[PDB]
Amino acid sequence: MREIVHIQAGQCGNQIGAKFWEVISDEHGIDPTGSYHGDSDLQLERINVYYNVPRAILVDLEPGTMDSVRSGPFGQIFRPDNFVFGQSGAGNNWAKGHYTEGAELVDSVLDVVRKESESCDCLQGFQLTHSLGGGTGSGMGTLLISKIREEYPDRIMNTFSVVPSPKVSDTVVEPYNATLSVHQLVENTDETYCIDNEALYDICFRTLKLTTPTYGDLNHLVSATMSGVTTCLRFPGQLNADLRKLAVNMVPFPRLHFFMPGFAPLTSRGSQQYRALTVPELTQQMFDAKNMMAACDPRHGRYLTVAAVFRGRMSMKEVDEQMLNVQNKNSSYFVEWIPNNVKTAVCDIPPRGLKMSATFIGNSTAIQELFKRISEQFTAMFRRKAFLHWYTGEGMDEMEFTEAESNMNDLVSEYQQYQDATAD
Amino acid sequence: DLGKKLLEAARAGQDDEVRILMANGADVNATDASGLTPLHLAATYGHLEIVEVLLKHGADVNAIDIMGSTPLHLAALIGHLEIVEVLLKHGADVNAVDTWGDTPLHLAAIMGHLEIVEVLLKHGADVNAQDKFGKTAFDISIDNGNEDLAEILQK
Amino acid sequence: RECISIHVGQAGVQIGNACWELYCLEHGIQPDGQMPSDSFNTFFSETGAGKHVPRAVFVDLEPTVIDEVRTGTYRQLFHPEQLITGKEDAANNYARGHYTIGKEIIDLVLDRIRKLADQCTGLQGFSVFHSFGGGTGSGFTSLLMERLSVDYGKKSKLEFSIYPAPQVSTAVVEPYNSILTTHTTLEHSDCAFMVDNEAIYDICRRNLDIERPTYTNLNRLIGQIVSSITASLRFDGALNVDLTEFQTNLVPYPRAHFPLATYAPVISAEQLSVAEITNACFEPANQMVKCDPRHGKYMACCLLYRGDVVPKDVNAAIATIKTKRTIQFVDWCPTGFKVGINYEPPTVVPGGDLAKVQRAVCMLSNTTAIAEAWARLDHKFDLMYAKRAFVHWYVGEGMEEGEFSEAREDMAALEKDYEEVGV
Ligand SMILES: Nc1nc2c(ncn2[C@@H]2O[C@H](COP(=O)(O)OP(=O)(O)OP(=O)(O)O)[C@@H](O)[C@H]2O)c(=O)[nH]1
Ligand SMILES: Nc1nc2c(ncn2[C@@H]2O[C@H](COP(=O)(O)OP(=O)(O)O)[C@@H](O)[C@H]2O)c(=O)[nH]1
Ligand SMILES: [Mg+2]
Ligand SMILES: [Mg+2]
């Protein structure tokens, strides 16, 4: 369990994707030319995970995205062969990404995926970043996942999927695309981090006091969360070391693998954090719903499993105390029938900018609130049958929408069942 | 198992290799399959030095097996007069019974060990003791034609 | 004479390092294998060039841990064919250790064991080191134990299991893995010493004075107590001189073969009497498994002293505890305390937080109160299996779901077996 192959698809896919490579290249001490200028061994200890030069494949039907990446800061480092781009765009049509145009290109992508996996000592799995309201990131991504799932069934599939919200784009077909895509992810991926644009806006607007958040503002929150949750994977550590061990200790039921991520402290784009937080302060950013990257209230549900990642030099004794504290002082919010379901890990290297930090990955049944929002928007749209001629024209059947609608509602009911469950 | 090597030796009669195995802390009362301790086996095949070695290291002189046989039973059966008096001196059960109802006096009389019969009797053997079929040691001399034994039983 | 050690999973391998580090100091053997100086060749073999090689196999379904062995202080000590590694780990999944991943390497592992057994003349049996909660430790060990009961069936096998504890626990499913291996390894193990990582944690925080112990801290403490148990086999003592005697003295029931080990004294490196250390053997704070023997009946009890000990001091300390405490025994037991002594001093590691003590003792006692430890695992197991939590991971790696229930019934039956003896 060593190497990880990374993929980014669609506009958002390559945006937060490149942002992620910017962050962890710095943290590992790699320059845009691809040379080590660090000063620590804990950095190159597990550099073989994401690098060889990144083990990254860049995908989009929109050919313009090619240059938006290469003209970026770390755009020079990506392998030229690993750019695979189509002629035209999908235009927010999931069917075009999943059945027609995205399907024609998906073979070329699998060829590069094969090439990068071929030269791996021991593959762990894959890592996809993409948006769910789009046509390419959602339609071709979910098609790519299934195509890899069947070509690499002995490996983990881990996605960073961002949820659409009216607060970030007024496109009304996004409920369609996201619902169809959720119907895929619940069946095709081992673990998926739910990035909610609703929550990214509400954090940039209300907590960071930015009246008009841009993509860059939301993308800053994403890339910082990603490096936090992938801290265990990139540096030496006992707990939640590899992708499979993580999913084993996080997902008790195969369909319920949608994590609500959140981390602390919330900073602005290059602002100054005056006083580094204390351990009890970081700890009290868990239930604090203003730190969740998904727009859900943990108070309204119950945690099945929890993983905490503290970055920086601090008291391992105090962290243990505070985590053991917050669990039993809110004992009604953690499921009783899973003992020792919360797991904490520490990493001495903090993230750049901050002295200390803490990321809070949680499988909370409250996530049903998120799927409620998407379904109600989907159903309102679907009951009036709007924009269906887009999808059906590309070979889709009206029945598919009903199945994805029903399958998402079953997913909601399951979360509600285990919320009302009792140990007795 | 060191308790199993000590049975192999005490049986076949390697006097020296008992001291070796016992210096390695072998179980003096180690049972084989049918419950026979090394003292049982040495008293069957007439290895006098091995009997006195095991007894003084702490061997159950009145240990029974799966069929209720004490080492004095087996010594009086085969006819090891040297061993019989060693066991009795170490507190052997002179009127022990086994699953077939026999005492050591029964076995020494059946096998014609007249010299051992007299030793058991003088250690307070039950001359009127009966077996399963209901026969005393005196009945065996009557039934078996041995008048040398009948006279030795009424002495 | 000889005895083979096997180390499975990170726990086994890393505790192995701590033990063979401590064995080489006790036997004056050098890191390169040499010796400027038999009873100790029960554990080591010899090269024609005067080099002493351990009779050990290291197994892990993933290189990282064993890679540090062959690039560490004792890289020269082991032959490279003795250190075996796969590539994909078991991922805290008994199924992968036992079914999916374990079958890919089990044959290579059994083959490398044959090469050490072929060098040996009168092989006694196997010592096995592994965790409970680990996927490799639970799954692969239970598989290897099955196959060793075939290819070497007519000899002994002893366990050194790491009982899990939330303070260092790496997985949620560690109750599952513990129950699953304990079910399938129950019939194939003659005796098994559990090590509760919580007690070792508690001990290191109280008596070694460490805020947050590391694995090295716990492993060093563990290696000391393991050395105390294997001392009788390595120096030719009077008690427990071979692997059979462990079953003879401590196991009066094939199933109930789980002794409680108590070790005193644990002195920080910053002397006690024979009586003082023997009283600490009946103090729960110094046990390796957290339970209360006062709530249970003793089936057997051995005392392994080592160091500056006068045999009469022992008998006084025994009579003191046999008179001034109420150690309840079962009626069908010899109820007499077995004793053995080895006059060599307890070796510590140069730099270790543990100090050199003049004398030391390790009490091995098969009390029925150790059932309390099984009850804690079974309860955690029941909560998760009541909702079939995490079960799909196991079933998806070659395991039938029924095996969960068959294992739980074997654990419930064992809890009844401990109860009926103690009533
Ligand atoms: N005492 C002690 N316990 C350990 C050590 N290493 C791991 N453990 C414990 O063993 C349990 C399982 O971890 P591992 O043994 O590393 O798992 P593994 O056997 O390597 O199996 P996989 O990693 O899943 O392939 C955990 O609960 C740890 O607490 C060790 O060196 N000493
Ligand atoms: N967080 C974030 N979301 C984005 C970004 N770009 C687009 N999105 C979201 O993704 C959806 C649009 O899909 P998009 O990726 O642009 O279409 P695609 O090119 O076909 O994959 C909308 O819900 C947007 O809010 C970005 O840079 N950051
Ligand atoms: Mg595009
Ligand atoms: Mg491992």
Residue numbers in the entry:
A (entry chain I): 1 to 42, 45 to 54, 62 to 360, 369 to 441
B (entry chain G): 13 to 167
C (entry chain H): 2 to 38, 47 to 279, 285 to 437
Sentences reproduced from the published study:
The XMAP215/Stu2/Alp14 MT polymerases are among the best-studied families of MT regulators. They localize to the extreme tips of MT plus-ends and accelerate αβ-tubulin polymerization in eukaryotes.
Crystals of the Saccharomyces kluyveri ortholog of Alp14 (herein termed sk-Alp14-monomer: residues 1–550) bound to αβ-tubulins and DRP grew in conditions similar to those used for SEC and SEC-MALS. In the structures, TOG1 domains were clearly differentiated from TOG2 domains by their conserved C-terminal extension and jutting α-helix that were unambiguously identified in density-modified maps. Each asymmetric unit contained two wheel-shaped assemblies representing two sets of alternating TOG1 and TOG2 domains oriented in a square-like conformation (termed the TOG square), with each TOG domain binding a DRP-capped αβ-tubulin on its outer edge. We hypothesized that sk-Alp14-monomer formed dimeric organization, despite the lack of dimerization domains, due to the high concentration of these complexes during crystallization. In a TOG square, each TOG domain was bound to a curved αβ-tubulin capped by a DRP through its outward-facing binding interface and was not in contact with the neighboring TOG-bound αβ-tubulin. Rather, DRP binding only caps β-tubulin, presenting a significant impediment to the polymerization of αβ-tubulins while bound to the TOG1-TOG2 subunits. The αβ-tubulins bound to the TOG square are positioned in a polarized orientation, due to the asymmetry in the TOG domain αβ-tubulin interface and pseudo-dimeric TOG1-TOG2 subunit interfaces within the TOG square (see below). The X-ray structures revealed that each TOG square is a dimer of TOG1-TOG2 array subunits assembled head-to-tail from alternating TOG1 and TOG2 domains.
